[PDB]
Amino acid sequence: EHVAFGSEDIENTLAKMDDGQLDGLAFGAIQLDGDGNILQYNAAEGDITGRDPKQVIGKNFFKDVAPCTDSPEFYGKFKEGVASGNLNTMFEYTFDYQQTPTKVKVHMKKALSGDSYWVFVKRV
Ligand SMILES: *C(=O)/C=C/c1ccc(O)cc1
16 A cells, blocks of 8 residues: 555545555554554554454553553553544554563544544564
């Protein structure tokens, strides 16, 4: 696919993509419901994090997959922006749960589809 991380209209462009098209992106992409359960998880993300994109669907991102993100600086921003319905935040973060610590840039943005929220990731 031909979509850049951080693009202004990213939520419109990604709405057309099934799992296979999402796997064509240059950056990691996760879709979460408002509780943090994983709805979609692409190949680029699995390459960064080590997780098997097929196995993490249905797991809770904050409680089980990514406890290092269960903090005010990541989960706190997510749950606030879900509550307001206007989630659009970008920040760097380090992933260090049972993995070599890996610093990334994270972009969380509310999707167009109902009860759906994007988490985009690239290496920094
Ligand atoms: C900290 O526990 C981060 C874990 C993590 C981040 C992103 C993923 O896609 C998977 C696990």
